[PDB]
Design a protein around this ligand. Structure first.
Ligand code: 4SX
Ligand code: 4SX
Ligand code: CA
Ligand code: CL
Ligand code: CL
Ligand code: FE2
Ligand code: FE2
Ligand code: FE2
Ligand code: FE2
Lengths: 358, 359, 358, 358
């Protein structure tokens, strides 16, 4: 993917995702009643939701449709003129673009959507309707309150190809996972001064791995799990809670009614200095994904959401040919270590903590 | 059946300390003091005496050097000096071997009785103990992972109903248990001090010691223990968790000491002190009973536990459980678990939850 | 001196509930249910019965409509039905007015004894109570400020030693107290259940009820109550705190209900169940005794407390304390407190800590 | 008015470190290392260099032995080496005294410019710094009170609008301020990195340094600092808090070092990185603006602050504020504050909240 002559748009941060869902009422139950997100607008076709500290119109749009999928992952840009820059940048890349002066969803103004070089539906916008910032509305605060939108994670077959593209677009790599023979399994990259605004996971794609929201404290994440147990929907807790190695964040992954994966995340570190030290982890290091060594559940490696093109049809999936992280770590010929070079605390042909793949 | 003595039961206050035999005293000290932050009451070349942040009795844990790692004694404090005599009479009537030492078996304990109980466990009963500085407001010493109290023991024994009746006669009240619909009991929890447990029975081959549990103030303190173990690159010694228990409702973690003695870190169970405290029975197939979030129970939790000693210092012979295995009926190849009773969606057949099978 | 009966004391388990008379039942409901999140066991046009998250007995708090806000009863649960007989014999021997009702004074309590005790307080003793759903795992109902247990009462009485001896004869065990170097006792704490207190005596004009205290799980739950009260613009009803207590070592907050009944929120005191539990005496001039961080005690904490009723529903006459006043000797114009005993640096003369006077 | 230079502003990343002169280096070391747990990057008989848990630059705090306790420099990191030249030209155009050292003023910093800025404050601008081990996952070193980041400075200056305009020209964006209906500004907060502040202006006699602020992960970390100070019997060095701020919404604590330099501990403010981030203005009489729970602001917080040095190491002359005093108008004899605007209930006249006066 060549670097355009045209300047990249100045991207501020991840801003919202539009997810297609099959049953809007069941989705509302999950995101509003279980998770406590705040309704900015709703009707029979869509629900627009925001986090506790947000002032732009929404962080999540649920749109009723026939096939559950990512419709758009939206980044806010610094100025109105940056939408023009986005259009010219992606035009030069040869990508299909669509510009709407009055936006694609309610509460957004002039917006550009693109089918990007990795097959993902990106939106770029500046203009958005401001709403009441709920950051001191402690009369509304949930024991599991979701306070910010933090990041997206994308599944794509060739991580270096996507990384180079995102670097040209101005994202900076913070962390990655590699092996000794030069394969890259995952990379994390940011615009705002946190570990990530989007991230790439090696795998068959394009698929959307997850959308991540932040909490203030670790106990808020614990409460989400506790509430899911009380609602007898613990089967929708996919992975965690844990401490990540990469990012150092406390985390949880859960599954919405259409199997879209949502991460809850807190307490990663500042990355805003331009010489921020990068960190590379070895793929066999059993503390890289869960710092406590807990096993990564196989569905985390295999399952992700479909994404749509700009006509609303599902994007064709291209298979990864580089090595599989699942296979090399927890498969029958996989291994992981606790201490590099130590047989004690290593796992061969199975996961940590006494489990193999089901 | 273990008969109810005519002699009155000793008035037991609480679990008070465990004496563990360890093979390398310095390695064990690194774990309990440097990693876990327990406070040293006394040590020499043979023993380390340790206590939690809020304790005023001499110790909650004694580490004794010896050739075979094992539980040497699980000690309960009784209400009065006279209760030690009551304990002796009670266990004598049960036909158990007993040993009485007027000046104690370990430093910082006075008059004490040790017994080989009817389940083959080495119990101690004592009242007299040397008081030490209660560190409960020593926030200059407080660790991010601070262990604040000894909470309980957990014992592996083959016949849970048999053990449960004996402990009830001794004055423990059952707070929670796990049963199935076919009349099998897999585990029971029982108290004196008005929390969920002072000891507990886990069905399996025994006598073996499942774990000793310490409490923290808050859930973040348990998280910090995990985080510190990751930083020390000993995450392989985190056996299971952290999690929320179904039974007890406590936030928990299980870790393994250098001799594979299992330690639970525990917080925020509930008050049980009323005599009609409702007893909660969970079904063994309920996948929220042990981990409320449905995370799978690691197989070693069901299979591994510490040897225990008799009064001569020799390991007690193990008697095999003949009742159904909790591992086998839940996560084994013919096992079953559910998320919602009567719902096939979210049930597991012949494997564990979250996409795993037995290794 | 209150004599020790020949009759054996009833075996008291714990504090169990308070009945408070309130003047506007709907306003009190808004406070206890909507602000504080207590759970309704039963309500009608005259009464609201409330319980904490982990309770299995019918209630921990009864709000009763009446003309004069006051404590109507402070209730302790006893170990067996026969202990209610023991309580009746004990208080009859003390020469106190008693009243026995086989079917209870409030809903969800059976055979019960109410007494006008030697200090003028309306005590209830009961065993029988209707069990309800224990909500301890109902995380679907859990508030960010959740009140999990009833912990204790605190009583204002003019002669603390006289009250202390009576409560000891009744089986309460003193855990901590406050004295000076001239033989005056200002406060004492005493327990049945193995925590720092089930009731406590504060020196002052009485009988008056100082507070009822509820527990939370964690310190952040108390912080949330404060945050919520700010958001509701009722921060003027936060009286004192939040803080760390010296006595008890608990994290704490005091707030005021619509009738100015004081509620404490409390967490993480220590285990006192061993019979030789070490007692702790603090000097009244030690500025870490009430707030460990040295924050000043607001003067209303010393002067204001609720009326109590006799068994005919009339307010008990208030008897004035003649012993020295904790307020006067610490923060009044001729008061004194210290940070370090014998150190002039960090001491306060004729004023409160942190730069304030009254 | 301070005119805007034609020379381009240096691109400022963030606050980076402060150099404080202290009178007894060992006593200061015991406070910052033993009490507060900061990490040693370098020390000798004259200086101690300290950093927070998540820092990768050489230090966040330099303690320098000297005769008069004062701020020696408040340092901001700039984006590129060239921005140091830009800073030099900018301040030269402003007519300010500057000093350039190509090898730095303190260890672990390279090419650096120090200036006596137009408000009389010793600012440093640098890019080059020695990287050190980032301790962000060193949980074997983590304290119960761990300080994780340097967050901000707060400066006392007599004319807030004058300083505000100057800092805006320098690229800082205002997030929040405190004003009255007469048009007086009492304080402003302004940022470069995406948080509420990198520096802040407090109206008062100046130039003086009000505080340096460090972050924690969670609210319980701040509570622990208080608890530890109680156990060390130095609760007299807890000046204000802990509390919830109105401005910023952060949980906070102010403590005093051995030379009375004020240190704030701070957590959980909000994201401000979007260019149209909504600005919040509070009324000076709002009793929830500084402490959200309505707790009173101690008078020393308004009156006391640290001296600052000029580039010859002499104390800067103090200029007195002529605008209205926030102390006098809120908690002074002729002051007032409110809980609910327009409501005399929960208002305080000629005294502070919670029953206190000056
Ligand atoms: O599981 S990892 O530590 O690799 C990881 C780190 C940060 C993330 O946000 C994530 O989804 C996954
Ligand atoms: O006390 S204030 O809420 O005004 C405030 C807010 C943020 C700060 O950093 C501060 O020092 C003071
Ligand atoms: Ca069956
Ligand atoms: Cl379990
Ligand atoms: Cl107090
Ligand atoms: Fe993620
Ligand atoms: Fe346990
Ligand atoms: Fe209290
Ligand atoms: Fe500040």
């Amino acid at each position: 993917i060549p670097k355009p002559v045209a300047p990249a748009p100045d991207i501020l941060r991840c801003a919202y995702a539009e997810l297609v869902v099959t049953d809007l009422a069941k989705s509302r139950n999950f995101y509003v009643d279980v998770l406590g997100l705040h309704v900015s607008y709703e009707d029979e076709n869509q629900i627009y939701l925001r986090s506790f500290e947000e002032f732009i119109h929404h962080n999540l749009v649920l749109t009723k449709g026939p096939v559950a999928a990512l419709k758009a992952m939206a980044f806010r840009v610094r100025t109105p003129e940056d939408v023009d820059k986005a259009e010219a940048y992606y035009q030069e890349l040869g990508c299909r673009t669509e510009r709407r002066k009055d936006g694609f969803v309610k509460g957004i103004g002039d917006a550009l959507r693109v089918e990007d070089p990795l097959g993902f539906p990106y939106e770029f916008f500046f203009e958005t309707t401001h709403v009441e910032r709920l950051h001191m509305r402690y009369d509304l605060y949930s024991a599991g309150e979701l306070v910010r939108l933090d990041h997206f994670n994308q599944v794509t077959p060739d991580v270096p190809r996507g990384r180079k593209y995102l670097e040209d677009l101005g994202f900076r790599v913070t962390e990655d996972i590699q092996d000794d023979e030069g394969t890259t399994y995952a990379a994390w990259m940011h615009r705002k001064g946190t570990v990530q605004d989007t991230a790439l996971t090696g795998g068959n794609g394009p698929r959307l791995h997850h959308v991540a929201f932040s909490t203030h404290e670790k106990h808020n994440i614990i409460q989400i799990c506790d509430k899911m147990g009380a609602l007898r929907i613990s089967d929708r807790i996919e992975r965690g809670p844990g401490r990540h190695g990469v990012s150092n964040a406390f985390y949880l992954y859960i599954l919405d009614p259409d199997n879209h994966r949502i991460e809850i995340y807190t307490q990663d570190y500042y990355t805003g200095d331009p010489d921020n030290p990068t960190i590379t982890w070895n793929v066999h290091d059993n503390q890289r994904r869960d710092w406590w060594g807990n096993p990564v559940v196989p569905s985390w490696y295999t399952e992700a959401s479909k994404v749509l093109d700009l006509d609303g049809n599902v994007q064709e999936i291209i298979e990864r040919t580089d090595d599989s992280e699942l296979e090399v770590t927890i498969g029958a010929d996989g291994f992981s270590f606790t201490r590099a070079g130590d047989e004690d605390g290593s796992y061969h042909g199975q996961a940590s903590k006494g489990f193999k793949l089901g």
